[PDB]
């Protein structure tokens with residue numbers, strides 16, 4: 060996963 | 065290693081230490097706030113955000129620290145020595161976790177940029193001698 | 206509040222505790238490995254991943270624990286009470302941090318699903334009585350970046 | 361030579377002294393503010409502004425004054441004389457650097473012309489008997505070019 | 509905070525220190541020179557340049573140090589004690605300020621790159637044992 | 650100056666210190682290997698490579714250190730100090746040179762990248778409790 | 792093995808020994824010079840040159856030597872024997888490092904061929920009895936032709 064915040 | 069817990073959130077230990085010790089709520093009040101506001105998210109199988117990942121660990125680390133400190137406190141038989149532990153915790157790791165829990169709870173509630181600008185405003189305000197200090201302290205919103 | 210540090214990572218305290226307590230490296234050895242493999246990432250201004258964020262706190266929390274434990278050691282009169290602190294952290298909290306540091310360091314190196322599969326495999330292998338135990342223990346191994354299908358497709 | 365540190369900044373020692381002594385933060389609080397707001401600028405290889413250049417020197421100068429005052433205090437035989445040195449510093453050179461550090465930090469933070477106007481406003485406010493003094497003191501609201 | 513007063517002028521404390529202490533003029537002689545060469549600019553209500561601004565502070569700072577040492581000196585009965593103060597300011601802060609004032613005064617007369625080139629030339633020259641040392645020392649132009 | 654002898658070769662002191670101290674051969678065994686593998690190159694008038702240049706200096710530095718340490722131990726007849734200098738050489742400077750000699754010797758044989766992968770692999774393997782430790786240690790190959 | 796530290800640089804120990812032991816600065820002065828002149832390059836992740844690689848090692852070896860010598864002196868309490876290590880360093884290892892530091896530091900500034908011609912000129916000059924010795928010592932460094940090719 061490529062985690063966006 | 066030299067890890068600063070604030071650095072991946074755009075702050076630093078030195079910056080959080082610009083707020084005076086008595087600015088922060090107690091650790092108990094911060095933990096009651098994290099629960100009242102974020103319990104469901106903190107307990108979920110979702111990461112939610114990097115602040116939630118950090119907050120989760122800090123809450124658990126504080127429980128570990130308190131278990132240890134309680135174990136020492138209760139097994140001491142001298143009120144002087146018990147007071148020395150409490151004082152040492154309140155001065156050192158208690159202040160650290162009040163800074164860190166306040167930071168993550170306030171970032172999640174008001175936003176990181178708002179929190180950082182506020183932090184520096186308050187720090188300036190509180191250092192101003194009372195005769196010249198603005199009547200209204202800065203507010204987060 | 207009831208927070209499981211592994212829940213957001215797809216695992217649970219009960220699952221990590223399926224590995225025997227003596228499987229895990231020491232904390233010191235885990236911390237050396239985190240540095241050797243991930244120092245630049247752990248120290249950088251970037252989140253990098255939830256594992257990195259959690260690993261950062263775990264490392265600092267161990268240092269908090271050790272600072273407090275050492276300061277308490279420094280105030281004790283009795284030599285036997287110092288060695289009861291040592292036993293105290295290394296029984297109660299040492300195991301818990303060895304699990305957590307191993308988990309994030311290994312997930313960072315091999316991936317969550319590889320690690321959880323290996324974990325239940327090793328747990329079954331080590332509970333097998335040695336006379337019945339298979340000779341080759343499970344091991345974590347890195348997945349290739351390019352499938353064999355992909356290399357053959359471009360021949 | 362007769363150099364007034366404020367003159368290139370459009371002020372004078374006489375004008376800063378129009379503020380009462382207990383207006384200014386402590387030197388320790390001013391040095392933590394300079395760090396919290398400007399540390400990266402203060403430590404860079406860029407001039408940034410004439411306030412930065414002055415603040416860099418003033419911070420290092422206070423460091424020199426403290427080293428000197430500490431060596432004096434260490435080497436005095438009388439504990440009462442150590443107190444006199446501390447008192448003398450706070451009433452004199454300490455007040456001077458509270459003024460100076462406050463000035464440069466406030467000019468960076470709020471604007472130099474704003475600070476100069478504010479100074480005269482506050483000195484007038486605080487000299488007013490409290491029965492006539494307006495309830496709210498004046499307050500201020502939160503890279504430039506500079507001519508030689 | 510870790511501030512190096514030379515860094516905004518392209519140099520460092522370590523570099524100035526490469527010159528030996530007896531290379532620099534005396535503080536009194538450096539303040540006479542600042543006055544003879546630069547007084548009107550130093551005294552004017554204009555910035556002039558970053559070197560002027562720094563030089564203005566260094567001069568005043570030395571006055572501060574000297575005012576404090578003198579006030580101490582006049583409240584000391586023993587002439588040997590005033591001597592130990594005199595020796596001390598010249599030993600410690602004296603060198604620091606001879607470096608700084610020399611640097612600003614020379615940069616204003618001969619320019620930064622000329623001064624830095626010359627500085628390492630002389631530092632190399634003077635570390636050469638005298639039997640091998642070239643006759644012409646480097647000079648500024 | 651703070652110089653890290655490994656930096657220009659893509660490594661650090663901290664990284665080499667990830668191998669346990671008893672991983673490395675004796676300095677004497679690394680010196681005999683450097684001679685068996687590279688004596689002709691080390692003694693020639695050509696640079697050969699930065700690793701050769703660095704290895705040449707470390708060999709000679711060890712020579713200077715032992716020359717100084719023997720003169721100390723030999724002018725001290727008391728066995729306590731004669732043996733205390735050996736202990737200090739073993740615990741301190743010896744380990745530094747075993748690291749550095751092994752680094753350069755292995756790099757000349759297998760290359761920097763193969764050596765650094767190996768180092769980290771072995772550093773993890775040897776920290777693994779024997780019950781879980783994979784049967785075959787990593788090695789250096791091709 | 793028999794390694795000459797100067798051989799890969801086109802010199803030899805015997806030739807550096809042609810300069811007298813009081814031609815060279817102290818090791819301290821050569822180290823402060825190496826820093827003032829080459830610090831950035833010495834501390835960089837780039838090889839830069841074989842002189843930089845070798846100079847890097849010598850700096851650190853001097854560190855090793857002085858740390859060993861200090862720990863010995865720290866654990867010698869008799870006033871006489873602490874001076875014994877200083878003298879030994881001064882007489883033996885210090886001169887070798889002063890040669891080597893000077894060689895690399897000068898080679899990086901002026902070039903091998905310049906340094907070696909200088910070295911031999913100076914060793915001749917200083918051996919010359921003062922009555923006959925030229926006034927100016929050698930130093931480390933056409934009009935018609937330059938104008939002809941304008």
Ligand SMILES: C[C@@H]1[C@H](C)N(C(=O)Nc2cc(F)c(F)c(F)c2)Cc2c(N3CCCC3=O)cnn21
Pocket residue numbers: 089093094095097098165166167169170203204205
């Ligand atoms: C940041 C300042 C001040 C300095 N405040 C805090 O720090 N509150 C705080 C208290 C906690 F218990 C806690 F866990 C926490 F993280 C922060 C309280 C505050 C507000 N609001 C918004 C609604 C109610 C309120 O007071 C606005 N601006 N401000």
Ligand SMILES: C[C@@H]1[C@H](C)N(C(=O)Nc2cc(F)c(F)c(F)c2)Cc2c(N3CCCC3=O)cnn21
Pocket residue numbers: 185186187188189190191192196197198202385389390391393394461462463465466498499500501502
């Ligand atoms: C200038 C007056 C008053 C007189 N204030 C100061 O002088 N603050 C001050 C404190 C320092 F620590 C310091 F280093 C400094 F240079 C100035 C404080 C102030 C503000 N603000 C803006 C955000 C919070 C606040 O209080 C506005 N108007 N005012």
Ligand SMILES: C[C@@H]1[C@H](C)N(C(=O)Nc2cc(F)c(F)c(F)c2)Cc2c(N3CCCC3=O)cnn21
Pocket residue numbers: 533537538539541542609610611613614646647648649
């Ligand atoms: C830098 C060197 C040398 C080492 N000199 C100094 O440092 N002079 C110096 C003396 C001061 F009193 C002072 F305050 C200051 F900043 C510098 C003197 C000098 C000259 N010239 C030019 C005109 C006359 C002269 O002597 C040229 N090159 N050189």
Ligand SMILES: C[C@@H]1[C@H](C)N(C(=O)Nc2cc(F)c(F)c(F)c2)Cc2c(N3CCCC3=O)cnn21
Pocket residue numbers: 629630631632633634635636640641642646816820821822824825892893896897909929930931932
């Ligand atoms: C080789 C001779 C002489 C014999 N000189 C040295 O050996 N200088 C020396 C000093 C050190 F501190 C050091 F670390 C080093 F490597 C060399 C000094 C020198 C120069 N120059 C050039 C600018 C200033 C100067 O004097 C020219 N020719 N010569």
Ligand SMILES: C[C@@H]1[C@H](C)N(C(=O)Nc2cc(F)c(F)c(F)c2)Cc2c(N3CCCC3=O)cnn21
Pocket residue numbers: 674678679680682683750751754755787788789790
């Ligand atoms: C790096 C590991 C292991 C950890 N080995 C060493 O470190 N050998 C070592 C011994 C020395 F004396 C020396 F000077 C040196 F630089 C290295 C030995 C080794 C081999 N090979 C290849 C042929 C025979 C062999 O055993 C392959 N992989 N490995």
Ligand SMILES: C[C@@H]1[C@H](C)N(C(=O)Nc2cc(F)c(F)c(F)c2)Cc2c(N3CCCC3=O)cnn21
Pocket residue numbers: 230234235236238239306307310311343344345346769770771772773774775776777781782783787
């Ligand atoms: C999970 C098992 C076993 C059970 N191993 C561990 O747990 N290693 C370990 C050691 C640490 F010091 C540490 F901090 C950590 F997180 C993990 C070691 C291991 C490997 N590899 C890969 C290269 C070398 C090696 O042995 C593969 N599979 N396995």
